[PDB]
Paper text:
Besides NADH-dependent ferredoxin: NADP+ oxidoreductase (Nfn), the best studied FBEB system is the electron transferring flavoprotein/[name] (EtfAB/[name]) complex, which is a key enzyme in butyrate producing anaerobes. The EtfAB/[name] complex is composed of subunits [name], [name] and [name]; each subunit contains one FAD as prosthetic group, termed α-FAD, β-FAD and δ-FAD, respectively. In the applied enzyme machineries, a flavin hydroquinone (HQ or FH−) acts as the bifurcating donor; one electron flows to a high-potential acceptor, whereas the other electron reduces the low potential ferredoxin or flavodoxin. All EtfABs are composed of three domains; domains I and II are components of the A- or α-subunit, and domain III of the B- or β-subunit. α-FAD is located in the mobile domain II and β-FAD sits between the rigid domains I and III.
The EtfAB/[name] complex was found in a heterododecameric (EtfAB/[name])4 state with a molecular mass of ca. 440 kDa. Architecturally, the tetrameric [name] forms the core of the enzyme complex to which four EtfAB units are peripherally attached. Each EtfAB unit forms two contact areas with a [name] dimer (the monomers named Bcd1 and Bcd2) that are placed around 50 Å apart from each other. The first contact area is located between the N-terminal domain of Bcd1 and the EtfAB base and is considered as fixed during the reaction cycle. The second contact region is formed between domain II and the Bcd1–Bcd2 dimer. In the determined EtfAB/[name] structure characterized by a pronounced domain II-[name] dimer interface, the distance between α-FAD and δ-FAD is 8.4 Å thereby indicating that the EtfAB/[name] complex is trapped in a dehydrogenase-conducting conformation termed D state. The edge-to-edge distance between the β-FAD and α-FAD isoalloxazines is 37 Å which certainly excludes mutual ET. In the D state, α-FAD is involved in the domain II-[name] interface and the exposed xylene ring is completely encapsulated by T343, Y346, and Y340 of Bcd2 as well as F155 and E198 of Bcd1. Therefore, domain II is kept in its position by its interactions with [name].
Numbering used by the authors:
A (entry chain C): 1 to 378
B (entry chain A): 1 to 331
C (entry chain B): 6 to 265
């Protein structure tokens, strides 16, 4: 029910101390070395995270998505790449297996994930099939008591580091999106090979790369859901993840704001600190309102999912609005640091580069607009 | 009346200086009460430390020589002091607030069932009521409270080392030697000392450091920092520095202080040749005590220093070393 | 093997500053936390729970808010929590405090009792050994490592110059130090259930064994006569000579107490 309960307070207290002590002083080392944070994954796992909103019987912690989203928010507040490693793991990889996988499947794949012993990833986007998701070109065909997989997925978060991949492929092209099926694919199988980790603008710690399937043989027992269900499985999976990313934006926005408030008080120009000029205040005001506004939209989506009310539109309003809010606020943030903001000794610029992707992936802000307007026009 | 008793501390048969300071304050408290001053000496072969105590103001020297006191272990010391204090009946008992003092006193005052004030910094007996006003700093140091022990005797306190001032050693005065016998049996020797190992002072991070000697651009070279590390040794704190020095290759980033290094709030900060941009000042503005050396009296750092010295680094620093190295050579 | 840890919820007095433009100390914003020596002890106990199979119980004296301390401790790995609240304790000094806590321990099965060296708000570092005296147990302070072998505890005792390697037959009280270990984080889910189910025991005076004339101010030998706030730092002097200069430095240092 209520979100100012001491329970959640106590989670937030945990998250903040983990963030400041374990994540914050790695942030830019991962930006500059463009390196995956293996250490803060295993550290993260140990303190419970990596399975926050899954039943204990499957190796998760017994939490709710609100306490999970709280975690993504409080991580991206200090380091955006780390935020996505989690949100991608819990929302994109773990959840479809939790929701659509049977009992054998939830025991062999869902438990290693929820316990933090392994790392999860979701592969849907292809070079010729991005926002138009149904133009999948990777094929799955059933041969004996194995499936054979051929094709490529580009831009997949938590590629190389990840252990379990929830990939989508056409099993009947001649039915469109009623022809996609979803498969659980373990890193190590013959034929499953990786790309080169991409060079990107800001989320440089997150390992993003290509999945390559060359006559890749898979047990038929790895089909997640029914044949042809994959489209709907991926669609509903993204509804959840949009919440994670919206909170990622939120984290970023709130961290960038927290940093400027620190600075604008220390820095004196013209005899008085920067915080004493009407424009820096009014800008801070406009920023805090956008962040607060966004907070409400993010968690109302979460709340909806936990109560099992429908949540896909709610999640899209949170993705659109926090993504924009992240971008505006980080930008105003660097501005307010002045020259020093533009240097990489301070973190605000990295937050600004981090922010931009929150308008793009897990569905672009245009896709969100398509969603919101669609449930409005009938 | 009673007497004013100071519990002496010795480590491998040398008196700790805080003891002799405490005998200092002891002669004042005792003179304000019209009573004399007593010393509790505890150890194994502690003979001769006695004459020292006499010289530093002690009038009675209560002595407990036993090989159970050879090495400090809480209980033999507690039992001994209880017996000896209970026997003298002091108006006031002072321990030095050390790792021994702050371990031994609370246990003694409990067994007596009196009251104890810890880590004190000021003592004096009120004109009216003649109680010992014991003032100690609390609440992480942001508070100064004055506590009294209304009814129970002896009035007890652990006192901060370095705060009370000693007496002038008088080689003529001998004192009375009390030669107090104490038995020590099994229910007291319960803690057994397997090994006494002495290791070194354990380098610490600058964020945690107590004193910082901080290098600026002013020093002018990497080996020129040795003179700082030399001084850093004599005060115990570590060396930190401005981004200037780190950039120039003189120190690890781990020693950088300021908006993009480390924020440090130590008890002392010595700025050696730092101009003090806001990038640096907002790193250490909150230190308890800041001392700065610069050639430029228009340096902005002086705008923050509690003691702004204007001089050459390479001529102040060695003079500060010579003055202090004779300081702890003599005392 | 039974381990009882005495944690005290304190306001974090590192984060206290005095506002120069009001004079007093900054009132709010200071979070309440497990005093750190105490969190450290709690760490050493849960370490023992994981290695030897011990049973960690945790107790705190204070007002209802100190519940949060026990819940933090529980989610870190403790098994039991006791919050001890009573009007009776109002004004307690370290005698009337150690005796209160001692009287509870009369009713809590123990083999090791762990407390922190110093509570960062009263700053006396006196309750640990006074509790041990009341209960007539051997005590070890300034603890830098804790190991057990069978019926005995092995402890390293930290000193100014040396450090002792010690051995005691259980029972015993140990005061633990803020560094010495690095305290593990809570587990989610441990937080979720510590709040969703809530096994935390709240004891009143009825639940302890004490002479009530040993509780609270009326039971406290020492008492607070006057107490005043820290003086705001002064102006600061800027000086021009030489080698009289280092004397400039050292006589102001002697003033703030480092005469060595
Ligand atoms: C760092 C990173 C990590 C990623 N991780 C993953 C991952 O783990 N898993 C995964 O499945 N995918 C992942 N992706 C893919 C990402 O979700 C896609 O980039 C996103 O869906 C947009 O698709 P696209 O790049 O092909 O853009 P395109 O579809 O080429 O679209 C580009 C632009 O055209 C606009 N546009 C497209 N179609 C329309 C239309 N009909 N009407 C109006 N405007 C339109 C879009 O809104 C956008 O501005 C990742 C991408 C990046 C950059
Ligand atoms: C993005 C960014 C981040 C930064 N972050 C930090 C940071 O975290 N920390 C930091 O410290 N700086 C930082 N800076 C730099 C900061 O602004 C200054 O450059 C820094 O204060 C330079 O160090 P300094 O005072 O030692 O050197 P200078 O300012 O060059 O001052 C040297 C001083 O030494 C004096 N002097 C020289 N020789 C002698 C002598 N023999 N005897 C006495 N006095 C002498 C001179 O009068 C002068 O006052 C940052 C800058 C940027 C752009
Ligand atoms: C300004 C001020 C000055 C004071 N001066 C004195 C004085 O000189 N002498 C004196 O006897 N009293 C004094 N008191 C009273 C004293 O602070 C309280 O009695 C307090 O209960 C015990 O002191 P402490 O908080 O310093 O604890 P400490 O003795 O520092 O704590 C020792 C350990 O005991 C345990 N512990 C302590 N309190 C609790 C608790 N409430 N619940 C659970 N475990 C606990 C913890 O493990 C802690 O690490 C003073 C109080 C104030 C406000
Ligand atoms: C899904 C996809 C590929 C296109 O297919 P889709 O959006 O499902 O379109 P349809 O289902 O065919 O259209 C639905 C129709 O059913 C109609 N309908 C509903 N109920 C009806 C009823 N009882 N009787 C008659 N008609 C009805 C609707 O009116 C609607 O018609 P309109 O076009 O006039 O609105 C694309 O639109 C999309 O949204 N992709 C999102 C991908 C994403 O987020 N990718 C990021 C992954 S990266 S980590
Ligand atoms: Ca490296
Ligand atoms: Ca005894």
């Amino acid at each position: 029910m209520d979100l100012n309960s001491k329970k959640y307070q106590m989670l937030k207290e945990l998250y903040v101390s983990f963030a400041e002590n374990e994540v914050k002083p790695l942030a830019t080392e991962l930006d500059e070395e463009e390196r995956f944070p293996y250490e803060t994954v295993e550290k993260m796992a140990k303190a419970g995270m990596m399975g926050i909103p899954y039943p204990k019987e499957y190796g998760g912690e017994g939490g709710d998505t609100v306490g999970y989203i709280m975690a993504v928010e409080e991580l991206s507040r200090v380091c955006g790449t780390t935020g996505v490693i989690l949100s991608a793991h819990t929302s994109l990889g773990s959840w479809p297996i939790y929701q659509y996988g049977n009992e054998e499947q939830k025991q062999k794949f869902l438990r290693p994930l929820a316990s933090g012993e392994k790392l999860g990833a979701f592969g849907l986007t292809e070079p010729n099939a991005g926002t138009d998701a149904s133009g999948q070109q990777t094929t799955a065909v059933l041969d004996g008591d194995e499936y054979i997989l051929n094709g490529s997925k580009i831009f997949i978060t938590n590629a190389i580091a990840g252990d379990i991949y929830v990939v989508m492929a056409m099993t009947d092209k001649s039915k469109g999106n009623k022809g996609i099926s979803a498969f659980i694919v373990e890193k190590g199988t013959p034929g499953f090979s990786f790309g080169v980790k991409e060079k990107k603008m800001g989320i440089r710690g997150s390992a993003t790369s290509e999945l390559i399937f060359e006559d890749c043989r898979i047990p038929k027992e790895n089909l997640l859901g029914k044949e042809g269900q994959g489209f709907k499985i991926a669609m509903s999976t993204l509804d959840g993840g949009r919440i994670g990313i919206a909170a990622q934006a939120l984290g970023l926005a709130q961290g960038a704001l927290d940093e400027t408030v620190k600075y604008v008080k220390e820095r004196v120009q013209f005899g008085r600190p920067l915080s004493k000029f009407q424009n820096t205040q009014f800008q801070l005001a406009d920023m805090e309102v956008k962040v607060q506004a966004a907070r409400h939209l993010v968690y109302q989506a979460a709340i909806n999912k936990d109560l099992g009310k429908p949540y896909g539109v709610e999640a899209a309003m949170a993705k659109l609005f926090a993504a924009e809010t992240a971008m505006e606020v980080t930008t105003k943030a660097v501005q307010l640091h002045g020259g020093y903001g533009y240097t990489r000794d301070y973190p605000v610029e990295r937050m600004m580069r981090d922010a931009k992707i929150t308008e793009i992936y897990e569905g672009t802000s245009e896709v969100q607009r398509m969603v919101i307007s669609g449930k409005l026009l009938k | 009346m009673g007497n004013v008793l100071v519990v002496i501390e010795q480590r491998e048969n040398v008196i700790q200086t805080v003891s002799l300071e405490l005998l200092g304050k002891a002669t004042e408290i005792a003179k304000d009460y019209d009573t004399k001053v007593s010393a509790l000496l505890l150890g194994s072969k502690v003979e001769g430390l006695i004459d020292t105590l006499a010289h530093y103001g002690a009038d009675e020297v209560i002595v407990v020589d036993d090989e159970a006191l050879a090495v400090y272990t809480t209980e033999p010391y507690t039992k001994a002091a209880y017996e000896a204090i209970k026997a003298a009946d002091p108006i006031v008992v002072l321990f030095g607030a050390t790792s021994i003092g702050r371990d031994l006193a609370p246990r003694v005052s409990a067994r007596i069932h009196t009251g104890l004030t810890a880590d004190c910094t000021g003592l004096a007996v009120a004109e009216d009521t003649k109680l010992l006003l014991m003032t100690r700093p609390a609440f992480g140091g942001n508070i100064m409270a004055t506590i009294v022990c209304k009814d129970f005797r002896p009035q007890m306190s652990t006192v901060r080392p370095g705060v009370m001032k000693k007496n002038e050693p008088d080689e003529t005065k001998e004192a009375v030697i009390n030669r107090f016998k104490v038995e020590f049996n099994d229910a007291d020797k319960l803690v057994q000392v397997v090994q006494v190992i002495k290791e070194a002072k354990k380098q610490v991070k600058i964020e945690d450091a107590k004193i910082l000697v901080s290098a600026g651009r002013g020093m002018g070279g990497k080996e020129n920092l040795d003179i700082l590390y030399e001084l850093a040794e004599i005060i115990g704190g570590e060396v930190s520095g401005s981004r200037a020095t780190i950039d120039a290759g003189w120190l690890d980033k781990a020693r950088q202080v300021g908006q993009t290094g480390k924020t440090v709030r130590p008890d002392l900060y010595i700025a050696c040749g730092i101009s003090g941009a806001i990038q640096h000042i907002a790193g250490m503005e909150d230190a308890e005590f800041i001392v700065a050396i610069n050639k430029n009296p228009e340096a902005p750092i002086f705008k923050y220093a509690d003691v702004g010295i204007v001089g050459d680094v390479h001529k102040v620093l060695p003079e500060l070393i010579s003055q202090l190295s004779v300081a702890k050579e003599k005392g | 093997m039974n381990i009882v840890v005495c944690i005290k919820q304190v306001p974090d007095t590192t984060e206290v500053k005095l506002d120069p433009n009001t004079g007093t100390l900054i009132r709010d914003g200071v979070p309440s936390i497990i005093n750190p020596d105490d969190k450290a002890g709690l760490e050493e106990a849960i370490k023992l729970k994981e290695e030897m199979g011990a049973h960690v119980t945790v107790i705190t004296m204070g007002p209802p808010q100190a519940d949060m301390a026990l819940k933090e401790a529980l989610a870190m790995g403790a098994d039991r929590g006791i919050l001890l609240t009573d009007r009776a304790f109002a004004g307690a000094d370290t005698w009337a405090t150690s005796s209160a806590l001692a009287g509870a321990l009369k009713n809590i099965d123990f083999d090791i009792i762990i407390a922190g060296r110093q509570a960062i708000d009263g700053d006396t570092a006196q309750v640990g050994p006074q509790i041990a005296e009341h209960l007539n147990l051997p005590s070890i302070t300034y603890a830098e490592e804790i190991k057990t072998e069978g019926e005995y505890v092995l402890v390293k005792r930290q000193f100014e110059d040396c450090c002792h390697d010690l051995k005691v037959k259980m029972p015993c009280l140990i005061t633990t130090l803020k560094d010495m270990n690095t305290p593990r984080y809570m587990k989610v889910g441990r937080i979720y259930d510590a709040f969703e189910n809530d096994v935390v025991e709240t004891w009143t005076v009825k639940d302890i064994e004490v002479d009530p004339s040993n509780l609270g101010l009326k039971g406290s030998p020492t008492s607070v006569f006057k107490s005043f706030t820290k003086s705001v730092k002064p102006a600061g002097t800027i000086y021009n000579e030489d080698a009289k200069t280092s004397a400039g430095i050292i006589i102001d240092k002697l003033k703030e107490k480092y005469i060595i």
